[PDB]
Design a protein around this nucleic acid. Structure first.
Ligand SMILES: [Mg+2]
Lengths: 467, 406
DNA sequence: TATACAACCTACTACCTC
RNA sequence: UGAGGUAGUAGGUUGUAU
């Protein structure tokens, strides 16, 4: 017999100073935080891709309904939500012919084909950025399904320095120019026409169309420079940081690159959420612990960024990771940290197999239920049942996060509240919440993009150039 | 009379007034405000007076710090009071408190007595209150699906949990009784101290120069005092032991290895085949082992179309926070009742297809049935090392103070 | 240098639903 | 890669003794 505590659902701040718990409800009822006047889009691909993009953009403007609106709120139209214009009349189209695609698409090798396709798609972007007089907010790269299927690291042809992934290499090669691009698939916007066996579409968006519209609109609005929502219950000068380690694979010797994501509250009552980059490297294979010098450099850079943004030093700095810090790297961390600042290192994992089944009901466990094992351990149900939407966020019994304070002293309830609030800042999607904290997820995205190339020297901190 | 008149300070309270007017129009009502419906080139004060006198059925008054002593708002309020007196309608004037900086003692007396609607905390809760008041007062409304959807969204936006206790069943099998002590046998003889380490009938692994086991020295005679230390289990579970002979964490690792080996060997003798995974091992029952695959009416083993699926349990002992066994559930597909498939992709795809229509109730029922069938007595089952460890067949329970009502 | 395992780590798919 | 979730398949590291 054990006791579970309940963590109150956090709120996110929308326009007019109004708070809500659901991003879709707050965006439909109130609207985004900031006002940008319009979105000018640049489309790349074949003429069929342009027609598909124009058709989807025209379809977006009118309201779209889901099959069951009690779980997925309907999309009321882009202008009726974001009070800004994203139309098909402001499209700067760059043409990519099928012959050019097929010149390198059907050729041999997996690294050369992807490199050539990425070069063909990216030279147009660079030239139109430098040698054209039209201002483009977001560049929408429509990729035919053949390129998506045939540009995987483990892909095999159907019997006739850079990563083999099309998306990661494409985003890495575009870092020196700071061009926010959204990669779309033809089957994503034209799912109704990509049938498989007897006219049945490969992907069924019939009952989802509203949610797809919500996600696409939110991503486009964020990449264009808009602020859809912000956290309302952020604490004092405390700063949250998150470290994620990645393998640089067979590029240049066994190496591990660590990338960080940073969040805090500025003096303008908003939220600063960017990335600490310059992936710090470790030459030892299989070790995910930062060397002392690189750890000191990381903490010094993050502290300097916070001091420049605010004007003083943070009261306490929380650190999240999927691994457990050792003593040497923690001592290196503390050597730089000022006395007034309190260092807390927290480890969040999703590996402990603790499944809770409801005794009678057919639904899963309520989201937010927490099992405090002891002072420095807890099990948090970030994914589960949400009373507002009469369905769970998972399919089977969800797995809970195992949050354990590795280093330093801090209240476990406060840590759980901070993590549950951090899980609300996913701008890559318009959902209720996600299991993983957004800091770790965005550090994951940043690392998996920055590990796809080696020519990057000073990567940008903003998130619109990665997500 | 179907209009809803909205009064406000025009150059200071436009945002909330426009928001409320558009929301009310979207819900099927007909509203009148001077920022959206006043015409150009018209005598505006006479038009406002005529609208108040002959058109409005309700009079919403945005009461804030700006409009508390605004002359136009006061004139409209006075005319509204006269019209309410003529109409004998007590609920004609509804003040909406949208400002938290307006003290209760500073509100003008004409609307102090009236029951306002709180908009300071949240505009959505205030809109819900407005909708409830309008529905109760039978305010005329002329809507078709869009209005209903918006109304449902506004009502449901604030849905939350209820403080009702609930009981959750986990998948952790707790440990009740541990053996008297952990045995270290300093033999070093008997074929390089039992060089097999993987064939003895009772669980045991080799330490530096000792064998760690809960069994006696005269029990491995089929495949094969001076036993020192002999640490008790109760004293070492609390982690109060030290010294250079063996570290406490290494002791915990040794004992958890012992329970894992015991769990493997005990029910490897149950004449039940197993499945090999990437990192662990899972064990599923055969088609003919159960008569007839309905243990406690739980439908343990079935078939999808022509392939037979089997429920499997994979167990592993752990000591953190306190000694229990974590057991997980899997689904394994075989063409026949007793066979195996080497196609990993087909097995995975069919498993994902089978797991899409089970849900929490079926998962818990099958898990409990499998864990009850593996039992050896009324309320537990024992593992053998000449000693025995009793493991409860009922998983531990969790209590929550909040829940929902479907 | 290999065993064996306890305790952790990432990389890459296939599937289902929002 | 519109986005999450749950699985499966692989490899690696540390420590404990030979
Ligand atoms: Mg995205």
């Amino acid at each position: 017999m054990k006791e579970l505590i309940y963590i109150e659902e956090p709120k996110i701040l929308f326009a007019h100073g109004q708070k809500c718990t659901d991003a879709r409800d707050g965006l439909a009822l109130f609207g985004p935080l900031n006002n940008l006047y319009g979105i000018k889009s640049g489309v790349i691909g074949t003429k069929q891709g342009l027609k598909i993009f124009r058709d989807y953009l025209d379809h977006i403007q009118k309201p779209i309904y889901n099959s069951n609106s009690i779980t997925r709120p309907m999309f009321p139209g882009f202008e009726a939500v974001f009070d800004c214009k994203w139309e098909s009349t402001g499209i700067t189209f760059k043409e990519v012919t099928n012959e050019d695609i097929g010149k390198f698409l059907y050729n041999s090798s997996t690294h050369k084909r992807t490199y050539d396709l990425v070069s063909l798609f990216i030279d147009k972007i660079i030239s139109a950025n430098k040698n054209e007089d039209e201002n483009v907010d977001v560049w929408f790269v429509i990729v035919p399904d053949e390129i998506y299927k045939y540009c995987r690291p483990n892909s095999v042809l159907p019997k006739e320095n850079y990563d083999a992934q099309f998306h990661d290499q494409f985003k890495a090669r575009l870092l020196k120019h700071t061009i926010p691009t959204q990669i779309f698939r033809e089957s994503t916007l034209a799912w109704r026409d990509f049938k498989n066996a007897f006219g049945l579409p490969i992907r069924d968006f019939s009952k989802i169309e509203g949610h797809l519209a919500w996600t696409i609109s939110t991503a486009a609005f964020y990449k264009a420079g808009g602020k859809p929502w912000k956290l309302s219950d952020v604490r004092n000068g405390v700063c949250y940081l998150g470290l994620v380690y990645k393998k640089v694979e067979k590029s240049k010797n066994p190496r591990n690159a660590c990338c960080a994501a940073q969040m805090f509250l500025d003096n303008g009552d908003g939220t600063v959420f960017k990335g600490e980059v310059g992936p710090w490297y470790n030459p030892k294979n299989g070790q995910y612990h930062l060397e002392p010098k690189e750890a000191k450099a990381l903490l010094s850079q993050s502290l300097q960024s916070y001091k420049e943004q605010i004007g003083e030093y943070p009261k306490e700095v929380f650190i999240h990771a999927k691994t457990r810090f050792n003593h040497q790297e923690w001592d290196a961390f503390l050597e730089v940290t000022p006395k007034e600042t309190n260092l807390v290192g927290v480890t969040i994992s999703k590996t402990k197999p603790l499944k809770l089944y409801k005794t009678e009901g057919d639904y899963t466990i309520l989201r937010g239920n927490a099992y405090v094992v002891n002072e420095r351990s807890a099990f948090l149900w970030t994914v589960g049942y949400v009373p507002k939407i009469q369905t769970a966020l998972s399919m089977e019994v969800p797995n809970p996060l195992f949050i354990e304070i590795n280093k330093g002293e801090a209240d476990i309830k406060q840590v759980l509240k901070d993590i549950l609030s951090l899980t609300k800042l996913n701008y890559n999607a318009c959902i209720f919440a996600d299991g993983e904290p957004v800091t770790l997820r965005f550090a994951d995205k940043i690392g998996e993009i920055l590990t796809a190339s080696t020519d990057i020297k000073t990567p940008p901190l903003a998130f619109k150039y990665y997500i | 009379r179907n209009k809803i008149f909205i009064s406000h300070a025009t150059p200071d309270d436009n945002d909330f007034t426009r928001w409320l007017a558009l929301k009310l129009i979207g819900l099927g009502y007909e509203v009148w405000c001077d920022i959206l419906f006043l015409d150009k080139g018209v005598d505006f004060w006479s038009n406002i007076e005529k609208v108040i006198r002959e058109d409005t059925c309700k009079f919403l008054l945005v009461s804030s710090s700006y409009s508390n002593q605004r002359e136009g708002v006061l004139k409209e309020l006075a005319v509204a009071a006269k019209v309410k007196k003529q109409l004998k309608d007590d609920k004609f004037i509804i003040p909406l408190a949208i400002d938290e900086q307006l003290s209760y003692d500073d509100i003008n007396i004409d609307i102090v007595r009236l029951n306002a609607i709180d908009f300071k905390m949240s505009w959505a809760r205030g809109l819900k209150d407005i909708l409830e008041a309008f529905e109760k007062q039978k305010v005329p409304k002329e809507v078709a699906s869009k209005s209903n959807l918006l109304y449902q969204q506004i009502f449901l936006h604030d849905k939350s949990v209820i403080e009702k206790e609930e009981i959750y069943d986990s998948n952790w099998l707790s440990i009740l009784s541990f053996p008297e002590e952990l045995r270290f046998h300093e033999y070093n003889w008997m074929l390089p101290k039992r060089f097999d380490v993987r064939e003895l009938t009772f669980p045991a692994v080799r330490y530096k120069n000792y064998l760690c086991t809960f069994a006696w020295a005269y029990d491995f005679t089929y495949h094969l005092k001076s036993k020192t230390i002999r640490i008790p289990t109760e004293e070492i579970l609390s982690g109060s032991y030290d010294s250079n002979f063996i570290r406490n964490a290494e002791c915990k690792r040794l004992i958890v290895q012992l329970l894992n080996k015991a769990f493997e060997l005990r029910m490897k003798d149950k004449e039940v085949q197993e499945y090999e995974m990437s990192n662990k091992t899972a064990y599923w029952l055969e088609k003919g082992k159960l008569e007839k695959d309905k243990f406690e009416k739980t439908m343990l083993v079935g078939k999808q179309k022509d392939k037979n699926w089997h429920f499997a349990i994979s167990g592993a002992s752990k000591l953190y926070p306190f000694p229990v066994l974590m057991i997980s559930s899997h689904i394994f597909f075989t063409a026949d009742g007793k066979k195996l498939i080497d196609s990993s992709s087909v097995q995975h795809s069919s498993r994902r297809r089978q797991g899409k229509n089970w849900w929490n109730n079926t998962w818990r029922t099958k898990l409990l049935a499998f864990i009850k069938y593996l039992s050896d007595d009324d309320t537990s089952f024992y593992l053998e090392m000449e000693e025995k460890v009793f493991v409860s067949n009922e998983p531990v329970k969790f209590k929550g103070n909040v829940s929902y009502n479907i």
